[PDB]
Design a protein around this ligand. Sequence first.
Ligand SMILES: NC(=O)c1ccc[n+]([C@@H]2O[C@H](COP(=O)([O-])OP(=O)(O)OC[C@H]3O[C@@H](n4cnc5c(N)ncnc54)[C@H](O)[C@@H]3O)[C@@H](O)[C@H]2O)c1
Ligand SMILES: NC(=O)c1ccc[n+]([C@@H]2O[C@H](COP(=O)([O-])OP(=O)(O)OC[C@H]3O[C@@H](n4cnc5c(N)ncnc54)[C@H](O)[C@@H]3O)[C@@H](O)[C@H]2O)c1
Ligand SMILES: NC(=O)c1ccc[n+]([C@@H]2O[C@H](COP(=O)([O-])OP(=O)(O)OC[C@H]3O[C@@H](n4cnc5c(N)ncnc54)[C@H](O)[C@@H]3O)[C@@H](O)[C@H]2O)c1
Ligand SMILES: NC(=O)c1ccc[n+]([C@@H]2O[C@H](COP(=O)([O-])OP(=O)(O)OC[C@H]3O[C@@H](n4cnc5c(N)ncnc54)[C@H](O)[C@@H]3O)[C@@H](O)[C@H]2O)c1
Ligand SMILES: Cc1ccccc1Oc1ccc(Cn2cc(C3CC3)nn2)cc1O
Ligand SMILES: Cc1ccccc1Oc1ccc(Cn2cc(C3CC3)nn2)cc1O
Ligand SMILES: Cc1ccccc1Oc1ccc(Cn2cc(C3CC3)nn2)cc1O
Ligand SMILES: Cc1ccccc1Oc1ccc(Cn2cc(C3CC3)nn2)cc1O
Ligand SMILES: Cc1ccccc1Oc1ccc(Cn2cc(C3CC3)nn2)cc1O
Ligand SMILES: [Cl-]
Ligand SMILES: [Cl-]
Ligand SMILES: [Cl-]
Ligand SMILES: [Cl-]
Ligand SMILES: [Cl-]
Ligand SMILES: [Cl-]
Ligand code: NA
Lengths: 268, 268, 268, 268
Amino acid sequence: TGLLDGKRILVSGIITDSSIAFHIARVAQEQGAQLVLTGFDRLRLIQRITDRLPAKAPLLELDVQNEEHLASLAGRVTEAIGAGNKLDGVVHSIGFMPQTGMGINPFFDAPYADVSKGIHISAYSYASMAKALLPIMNPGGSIVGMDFDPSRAMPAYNWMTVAKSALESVNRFVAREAGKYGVRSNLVAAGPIRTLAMSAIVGGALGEEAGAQIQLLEEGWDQRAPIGWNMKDATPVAKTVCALLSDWLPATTGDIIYADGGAHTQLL
Amino acid sequence: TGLLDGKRILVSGIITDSSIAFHIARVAQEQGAQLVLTGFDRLRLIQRITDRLPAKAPLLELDVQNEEHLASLAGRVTEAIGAGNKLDGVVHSIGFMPQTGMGINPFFDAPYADVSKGIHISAYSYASMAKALLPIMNPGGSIVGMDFDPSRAMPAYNWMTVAKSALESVNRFVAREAGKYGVRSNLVAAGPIRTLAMSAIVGGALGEEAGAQIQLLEEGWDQRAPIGWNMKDATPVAKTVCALLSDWLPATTGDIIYADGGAHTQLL
Amino acid sequence: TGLLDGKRILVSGIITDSSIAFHIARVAQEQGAQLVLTGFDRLRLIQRITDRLPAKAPLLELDVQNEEHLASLAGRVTEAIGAGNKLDGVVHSIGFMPQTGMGINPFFDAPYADVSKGIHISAYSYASMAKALLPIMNPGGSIVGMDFDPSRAMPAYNWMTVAKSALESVNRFVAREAGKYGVRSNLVAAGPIRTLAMSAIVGGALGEEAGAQIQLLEEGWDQRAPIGWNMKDATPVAKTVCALLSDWLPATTGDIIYADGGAHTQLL
Amino acid sequence: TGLLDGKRILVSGIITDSSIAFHIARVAQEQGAQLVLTGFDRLRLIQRITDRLPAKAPLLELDVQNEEHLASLAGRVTEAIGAGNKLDGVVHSIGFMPQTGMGINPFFDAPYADVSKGIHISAYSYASMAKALLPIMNPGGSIVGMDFDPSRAMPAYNWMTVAKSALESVNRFVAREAGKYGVRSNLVAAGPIRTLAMSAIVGGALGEEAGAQIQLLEEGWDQRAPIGWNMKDATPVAKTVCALLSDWLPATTGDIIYADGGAHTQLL
Ligand SMILES: NC(=O)c1ccc[n+]([C@@H]2O[C@H](COP(=O)([O-])OP(=O)(O)OC[C@H]3O[C@@H](n4cnc5c(N)ncnc54)[C@H](O)[C@@H]3O)[C@@H](O)[C@H]2O)c1
Ligand SMILES: NC(=O)c1ccc[n+]([C@@H]2O[C@H](COP(=O)([O-])OP(=O)(O)OC[C@H]3O[C@@H](n4cnc5c(N)ncnc54)[C@H](O)[C@@H]3O)[C@@H](O)[C@H]2O)c1
Ligand SMILES: NC(=O)c1ccc[n+]([C@@H]2O[C@H](COP(=O)([O-])OP(=O)(O)OC[C@H]3O[C@@H](n4cnc5c(N)ncnc54)[C@H](O)[C@@H]3O)[C@@H](O)[C@H]2O)c1
Ligand SMILES: NC(=O)c1ccc[n+]([C@@H]2O[C@H](COP(=O)([O-])OP(=O)(O)OC[C@H]3O[C@@H](n4cnc5c(N)ncnc54)[C@H](O)[C@@H]3O)[C@@H](O)[C@H]2O)c1
Ligand SMILES: Cc1ccccc1Oc1ccc(Cn2cc(C3CC3)nn2)cc1O
Ligand SMILES: Cc1ccccc1Oc1ccc(Cn2cc(C3CC3)nn2)cc1O
Ligand SMILES: Cc1ccccc1Oc1ccc(Cn2cc(C3CC3)nn2)cc1O
Ligand SMILES: Cc1ccccc1Oc1ccc(Cn2cc(C3CC3)nn2)cc1O
Ligand SMILES: Cc1ccccc1Oc1ccc(Cn2cc(C3CC3)nn2)cc1O
Ligand SMILES: [Cl-]
Ligand SMILES: [Cl-]
Ligand SMILES: [Cl-]
Ligand SMILES: [Cl-]
Ligand SMILES: [Cl-]
Ligand SMILES: [Cl-]
Ligand code: NA
C-alpha cells in the first residue's frame, strides 16, 4: 500500500530530473499520491521533464515573486483537482540567490537588491505559498520545505545561509497559522545533492575554486555522517519528505528533520 | 499495507497498557511487524498486559543493570526469532530515578548513589542495549530511544533532566557504532504522556493527580503546540517511533525527532 | 580604572534616553571610552538627548539604507577622532519593521516590500556597517549587535523574529571577515527593555491588545529568569555590551551572549 | 584598577602550572581578588605550584567524591577568609574519566562503574560544590564551571562528552538554586588547552594514535576559529572566566560562554 494513498499533493520546484523536487514527486507517485506540479519560467522544458515521472500530473505556472500567480493559484489548483477536493500536502522546493551572494564573491560586496531577491524567493515565498494554499487544504495535511543547515556559517553558501536562517524562522510562524487548519509545517534539512542549482549557481560562483566546494561537501557530510552520504542519490531526501507528507509524523510541526546521514550531530 | 511488514523488532519498557512502549508495540503490530518484548521485574504482570496486544509476542526478562541479562540477551532473542534471523528494529523505552532526584525533593539533597542509578538505567542502558543487540541486527535497521526535552531546566524533572541530557549525548555516540552495521540510532523527544512513571514523579502514584505538575505540562506543551497536545493519547508518539523504525527516515541518525505537537518551536 | 580606558568606540542607535544604545554609551563613557555617535533622521532631537550623556561626543548622520552615508562613514569618523587613529569598538543598536510585520496584523498579510525594508535595516546593515568600519578598526577590536532570541516563534514579534534569525546568521559571516582584522563580532540577546521601539512600534502594532504584550514579556522573562528581569533597567544589558567591547571576552566571536536574566535556559 | 577588586573567590582544580585553574587564579589575582584554593590528592605538589602565583593564598583539600570534605568545606573556607566574610566567586575547574571511557578504547567497552566515577567528579560535583558553598556566598556572586562543547559527538572525547552534556544540564539547575541567593551559575566552553589532563588522560587513551590527534586539534580549532586558537595559551580562557566572576555579565545565568575563538560557530 501507498504511504500516500489518495493524498492530493502539490510539488513545486522541478527544473531538471536531478532536482530534489523531481525525486520527491517520483517517490510520492510510487506511493499512491495524485500530484499537481508547479514550475517557473521554462514551462515547455519542465513539461518535457515531468512526462518522465511515473504518472501524468497537471503542471501550473508559479513564479513566487508574482502576486497575480499567488492570488490565482488556489483557483487554478482547485480546477486541476476538481471542485470540492483539496490538497493534503504542499512541497516547497524553491530557492534562488544571485551570483553576487555566493561563492568567492566577497560577502560584503553583495548589494541588498540582490540579497533581497534571494530572501524573497527562498524564504518569504514559503509564507506566501502557505497563505495561498492553506484555504484549500484538508485537516491532517502537511506543508514541507527544503533547508540546508544554516546554524553555523560556512564558505561559499554566504547569503544563501542567511536566507535559510530566515526560512527556518518563517517555517515556525507558518506552523502557527497552519495549526488553525489542522496542518503541519516542517523543513527537511538535506545533505548536499548534485542538482542544477548546486553545480551552476553555487559551483558557478566559485568558478576557478570549484574543486574547493567538493572538499567542503565531502568533509562536512560523508566523513561526518555515521551512515555515509551520497550526493548523487536524492532518494533518501525524497523519502524523508514523503514521511512528513504522510500520517506517520503527526506530532511534528514548526520543526526541521535532518536528512543528512547524521552529519550535523558529529563534529568530525 | 504494513509500514513495518516483515520487520523483526524488539520493544522494551512495557509495564502498564498506558506505557509508551505498549502503544509503540501495538502500532508496530498493526503495521505488520513481528515483535520480541522485554520486561523488568514483574514478568507475570507484564505477560498479562502484553496478551492485550493485537498479536502474541515472545517476552524476555531484561533488567538493564544486570550484566548477565545483557550478555545473554542476543542469544535469547536469536532463540525467540529463529536462528539465521535478525532484528531490524530495537526500541529503548526505559527510565528510572529514585524519589530523591525528582519532584519537590530539593535538587541538592539527592545523593550521588541515587542519581547514578538513574543515569545507569535511563542513559547508559541505551549504549549497553545497543552493544548487546547490534551483533544481531540487519543492515538498514533502526534503534530508537525515548527522550524528554532536557535543553532547558524545569521544575520537578530535576535529576531526570540530567539523565536525559546524558542520553542525548549517548545517542550520538551510539550512532557512530551503529553506523558500522548500517544501523541508525535516534531519539524521540515526546511530549508528556499520562503513564505510570509520570504519576510517580511527584509524590508517588495513588496520590491525587498533583495540580502544579499538570499545570506546568499544559503550559509547556498544549498551549505552546500549534497543533495541540493531548497527554492521554500516546498514538502520535508511537507513530513517530514507527516512522523511525521504518524505511522512510533513512538518512537520519544521531538525532532527535520531536513528537511534541511542535511545542519546542514556540516560546509562548 | 575604566574597563574601556582609551578605547575609541562608535555607538549607533540612540533616539531617546530609554534607548539601549543610550545606556550602552553612558556606561562606556563611565568606563573611560571616547565615543563617536551615529543617529538616524531626527538629528536635532538626538543631539539634545546625547548632551545628557556624561561627556561630549561627536554625532554623525547614518541612515543604513543610504549608500552615500555608508561610503562616506569611515572618512567622517576618521575626521571626528583624528587621522592615524582608529576605532576599537563598534555597536550596532539598530532595528526597524513596518507595523504590517508585527503585532496583531496577520503574519501572511505583511507584503514583502515591508518585510524587506525591515531585514535591510535590522539584518543586512550589520554587514554593511562592518564593511564600512573594519578598514578603520584596530586589531583586538570588537563589533557588537543587539538581538532578541528568535530561535522559537512567538506572538507579535512576527517578521522581526525573522529579521533577527537573519541577523544571527549574518553575525557569523561578519565574524569571518572581522577575523582577518583581528576583530570580534558578537550579538547580545537582551531581554525586554522598555524603549521607544518596544512601546510605539511593537505595542503600537497590538493597538488594543497592548496589555497582552506586557503579560507575555513578564511570562517569557522575569518569571523564567532565575535572577529576575526588570524591563525598566537597561544597565545589565549595557554592561554586557561593554564586556564584549572590552578585552575580557577575547576568545568569543560569531556568537551570542544572552543578557536575559537566564530566561532562555529555563522552560518556565 | 582590578576587575575583581576585593572579591573573595574560591578556585578549585589546580594540579600543574599548565592547568586552566592556575591561569584563572593568576589572572584573578592580577585583577585584585583574594583567593582561596582547593586541591585534590597531591597537596605538597599543588602547594609548590601555587607558590608560583603572584600572591599568597590559602590551600584546602577537596576531593569531590568525599562527603566529609564537602560537609566541612564551608567551615574551612570561613576560617580561611575570616568569620563574617563570604565568597563572591566559586570556580569549578575539575574533571576525570577513566581510560576506558576515552580515546581509541571502544565506546561500548567502558563499564558503568568507570563512567559513573567520571560523571560523579565531572558533573555531579558542580552541584555538590554549589550546595556546600552557596550558604557562604554574597548576593551578586558568581559560580563558574569549565565545559567542552558536547552538543555534537566526536572522536576520543567519548564518555567525557556524556559527562559534559550532563554538566550543562546540572548548570541550569544550579542556576535556579543559586538564583535564590542572588548568585549566577555559568559554564565556559573552552577550546583545547595543553594541560595535564589533555595530554596524559586524553592523549594517553589514544596511545599510538596520540601525536597526530594533538596536531589535528590545534589545526582545526584554529582553522575554524575566525580569530584563531592557540592551545598553549590559557589566558583567553582565564579572562573569559574572570569576566563571569566580575560584575560585567550580571544578566547571564544557567548559560554557556564559548571561549573557543568562535570555532563552534563555523562549520569549516
Ligand atoms: N541541492 C542541494 O544540495 C540542496 C540541499 C539542501 C537544500 N536545497 C534546497 O532544496 C530546494 C530545491 O533545490 P535543488 O537543489 O533541488 O534545485 P533546483 O535548482 O533543481 O530547484 C530549485 C527550484 O527553484 C525554482 N525557482 C527559482 N526561482 C523561482 C521562482 N521565482 N518561482 C518559483 N520557483 C522558482 C526553480 O524553478 C527550480 O525548480 C531549494 O530550496 C534549495 O535551497 C538544496
Ligand atoms: N510519559 C511521558 O510523559 C514521557 C515523555 C517523554 C519521554 N518519556 C520516556 O519514555 C520512556 C518510557 O516512559 P513511560 O512514561 O511510558 O513509562 P513506564 O510507565 O513504562 O515507566 C518505566 C518503564 O521503565 C522500565 N524500567 C525501569 N527500570 C528498568 C530496568 N532496570 N530495566 C528495564 N526496564 C526498566 C519499567 O518496566 C517500565 O516499562 C522513558 O525513557 C521515559 O523517561 C516519557
Ligand atoms: N527593547 C527591547 O526589548 C529589545 C530587546 C532586544 C533587542 N532589542 C534590539 O536592540 C536594538 C536597539 O533597540 P531599542 O529597543 O534600543 O530601540 P530604540 O527604538 O530606542 O532604537 C531604535 C533605533 O533604531 C534606529 N534606526 C532605525 N532605522 C534606522 C536606520 N535606517 N539607520 C540607522 N538607525 C536606524 C533609530 O534611530 C533608533 O536609534 C535593536 O536592534 C532592537 O531590535 C530591543
Ligand atoms: N584542557 C582543556 O583543553 C579543556 C577544555 C575545555 C574544558 N576543560 C575542563 O577544564 C577543567 C580543568 O581541566 P584542565 O584541562 O585544566 O586539567 P588539569 O588535569 O590540569 O586539571 C583538572 C583538575 O581536576 C582535578 N580533579 C580530578 N578529580 C578530582 C576530584 N576527585 N576532586 C577534586 N579535584 C579533582 C585535578 O586535581 C586537576 O586540578 C575540567 O573540567 C576539564 O574537563 C578543559
Ligand atoms: C536552489 C538554490 C539556489 C541558490 C543557492 C542554493 C540552492 O540550493 C542548494 C544547492 C546546493 C546546496 C548544497 N551545497 C551547499 C554548498 C556550499 C558550498 C558549500 N554546496 N553545496 C544547498 C542549497 O540550498
Ligand atoms: C520512566 C521515568 C522514570 C522517572 C521519571 C520519569 C520517567 O518517564 C517520564 C514520564 C513523564 C515525563 C513527562 N513529565 C515530566 C514531568 C515533570 C513535571 C515536569 N512530568 N511529566 C517524562 C518522563 O521521562
Ligand atoms: C493507577 C495508575 C496510576 C498511573 C498510571 C497508571 C495507573 O494504573 C495502573 C498502575 C499499575 C498497573 C500494573 N501494575 C504495575 C505494578 C507494579 C508497580 C510495578 N502494579 N501494577 C496497571 C495500571 O493500569
Ligand atoms: C528597534 C525595533 C524595531 C521594530 C521592532 C522592534 C524593535 O526593537 C525591539 C523592541 C522590543 C523587543 C522585545 N519585545 C518583543 C516583544 C514582543 C511582544 C513580544 N516586545 N518586545 C525586541 C526588539 O527587537
Ligand atoms: C580534566 C579532564 C578529565 C577527563 C577528560 C578530559 C579532561 O579535560 C579536558 C582536556 C582537554 C579537553 C579538550 N579536548 C578534547 C579533545 C578530544 C580528544 C579530541 N581534545 N581536546 C577537554 C577536557 O574536558
Ligand atoms: Cl562518524
Ligand atoms: Cl533510501
Ligand atoms: Cl510479577
Ligand atoms: Cl515529590
Ligand atoms: Cl490529561
Ligand atoms: Cl584544608
Ligand atoms: Na582561522
